[PDB]
Amino acid sequence: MLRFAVLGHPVAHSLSPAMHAFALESLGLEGSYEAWDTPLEALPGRLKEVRRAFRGVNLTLPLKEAALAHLDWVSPEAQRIGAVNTVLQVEGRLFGFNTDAPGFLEALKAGGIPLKGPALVLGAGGAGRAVAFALREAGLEVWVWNRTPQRALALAEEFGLRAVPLEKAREARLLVNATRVGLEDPSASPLPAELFPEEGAAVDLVYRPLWTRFLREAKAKGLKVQTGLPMLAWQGALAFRLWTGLLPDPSGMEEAARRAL
């Protein structure tokens, strides 16, 4: 049967096991999807094991960027993004892909979020780079910001976007939190309330808590909002199709993650 896993640290709280358990039974397939705590230093040995006993694995912090160097092939998109969130194992070879980017666009459509810019992505790490890549592919005007400017500049220069100071958030029509600010901390938000735009939409990739301070601020501000679950479900469904050629129902996977938190 199909052996899958999400590698990272921390991963004991991942909702992927629940989503793909649904995927497997839903498609009538026998298999498992476990959470395997993997610290950066353990990554090399961990991928060696993946080559022998797993059909595929998802990668999460802090392994998405370091993984590229240990793979046999990286997709053109994952190369530009500089992060791989999905690995396929065939004949002991590892192929890297990024389903965070396409998953994000699918989630936006599923949420009725209009593809209207300027779209400001907060955070220029792996997740932020994937979101910026996806919004660029969708043809929107994209702005990027990062606590450390050079990271946002590098991204804007590489993708041909615009790096902006944080206060430009008031002029964005779509705001996406791709930072980890807010993770398990209801008191923290990456953006001061007064910097939110008075109209538009906001999406948060952080889904622990589900209704983060950022999202609650955005909703109260008069912005249309979307939690991080739709993207989580779509990037997962897309990864499952990469591994098997079959697409499990994204909404079903979303529902499964919702019940798992």
Ligand X SMILES: O=C(O)C1=C[C@@H](O)[C@@H](O)[C@H](O)C1
Known binding positions: 14-16, 60, 85, 100, 123-127, 146-151, 205, 207, 228, 235
**Residue 168 annotated among the catalytic residues of the structure:** no
Residues that bind ligand X (CB under 6 A): 6, 14-16, 58, 60, 85, 100, 235
- The terminus-to-terminus CA distance of the chain in angstroms comes to 27
**Helix/strand/coil for 51:** helix
- By CB under 8 A, tell whether 33 contacts its own copies: no
Q: Which amino acid is at 163?
A: A
What mask of x and - would describe binding to its own copies in positions 95 to 114, judged by CB under 8 A?
x-x-----------------
User: If contact means CB under 5 to 8 A according to the sort of partner, which of ligand X, its own copies, none does residue 235 touch?
Assistant: ligand X
- Of 179 and 235, nearer to ligand X (C-beta) is 235
CB 162 within 8 A of CB 107: no
Catalytic residue, from 64, 116, 168, 219: name it.
Answer: 64
Q: Which is nearer to ligand X, 129 or 151 (CB)?
A: 129
CB count within 10 Å of CB 119 equals 27
The DSSP element (H or E) to which 4 belongs, if any, is strand 2-8
Q: Which does 177 bind (CB under 5 to 8 A by kind): ligand X, its own copies, none?
A: none
Q: Does 48 bind its own copies (CB under 8 A)?
A: no
Is 170:199 a contact under the CB 8 Å cutoff? no
Short-list 197, 203, 211, CA closest to 114: 203
Task: Determine the distance from the C-alpha atom of residue 68 to the mean position of all C-alpha atoms in its chain, rounded to a whole number.
Answer: 17
Distance separating alpha carbons of residues 254 and 252, to the nearest angstrom: 5
Residues in touch with its own copies (CB under 8 A): 2, 28-29, 55-56, 72-73, 75, 77, 88, 90-91, 93, 95, 97, 242-246
**Which residues form the catalytic set?**
64
